């Protein structure tokens, strides 16, 4: 039963549309925390209420290594406060923009944790709806913490994410699947070699325009066995994209030759690779 006051408020670590994270220390423990604050005349004014709830509904529900974990919820008169682990290391963006493109041992790898992650994910019937490195955190050790719920579809037609990673199915037909999610695996993989994303734009009208024509093309240097699993995530029609449930899921993902090597039992135990370059 936790209040502001047990709690010294440090540096921003993010900020989001109706939100800021910043990270805080416990003064009994000496704990760090990154509490996410929300205005609620904001929240209240701006109708984002359901937004929270999807969030407090959805991380209430997830217990992976892969994923930022709620620990606990309080409130004064102006802002309600959420306790989430904190991600030393920040966010996957931060070193696509730091080094450009990556090498295969590192592709590999991080590539693997979000599939890994997206299998957890995928099986609790919640659809994320809005992955890209920006949201894919990176904590102390170097392992992916993967975060930003709000907007997230649970499963028992509203949201469109971030321009560059929408799948055509959620442009067009307006519904998400889990398959969306691996249009955005493809988009990050693409980016992670490529070191920019595949769809590339004047404006947003010009990337989604690329996005439904499948206009997107391959840079020279491209590892073939990555560049092969890009063309297998990046399929216009959902039903045919490697990793679905009409394709048999996530074992043939994971069997993909890009993956030669990759220990699929307890990845989070295993040292992650130092971040290089390929150039
Ligand atoms: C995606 C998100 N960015 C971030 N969300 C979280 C961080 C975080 C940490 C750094 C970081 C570490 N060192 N320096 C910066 C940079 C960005 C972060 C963290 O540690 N723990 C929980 C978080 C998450 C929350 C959930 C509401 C989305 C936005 C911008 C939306 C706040």
């Given at each position: 039963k936790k209040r502001p006051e047990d709690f010294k408020f440090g540096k921003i670590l993010g900020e989001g549309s109706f939100s800021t994270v910043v990270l805080a220390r416990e003064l009994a423990t000496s704990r760090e925390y990154a509490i996410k604050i929300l205005e609620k005349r904001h929240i209240i004014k701006?109708?984002?209420?359901?937004?929270?709830?999807?969030?407090?509904?959805?991380m209430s529900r997830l217990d992976h290594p892969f994923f930022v974990k709620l620990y606990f919820?309080?409130?004064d008169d102006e802002k309600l406060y959420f306790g989430l682990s904190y991600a030393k290391n920040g966010?996957?963006?931060?070193?696509?923009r730091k080094i450009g493109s990556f090498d295969e041992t590192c592709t590999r790898f991080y590539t693997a944790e979000i599939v890994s992650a997206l299998e957890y994910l995928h099986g609790k019937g919640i659809?994320?709806?809005?992955?890209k490195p920006e949201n894919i955190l990176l904590n102390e050790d170097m392992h992916i913490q993967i975060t930003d719920f709000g907007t997230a579809?649970?499963?028992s037609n509203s949201f469109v994410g971030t321009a560059q990673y929408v799948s055509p199915e959620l442009?067009?037909?307006k519904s998400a699947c889990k398959s969306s999610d691996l249009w955005a695996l493809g988009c990050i993989i693409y980016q992670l070699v490529a070191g920019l994303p595949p769809f590339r734009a004047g404006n947003e009208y010009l990337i989604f325009q690329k996005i439904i024509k499948l206009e997107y093309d391959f840079?020279?240097?491209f590892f073939p066995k990555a560049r092969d699993l890009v063309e297998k995530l990046l399929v216009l029609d959902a039903t045919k994209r490697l990793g679905c449930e009409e394709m048999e899921g996530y074992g043939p993902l994971k069997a993909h030759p890009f993956f030669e090597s990759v220990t699929w039992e307890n990845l989070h135990q295993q040292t992650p690779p130092k971040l290089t370059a390929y150039l």
């Open positions: 701006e109708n984002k209420v359901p937004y929270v709830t999807r969030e407090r509904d959805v919820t309080f409130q966010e996957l963006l931060k070193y696509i659809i994320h709806r809005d992955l579809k649970v499963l442009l067009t037909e840079p020279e240097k």
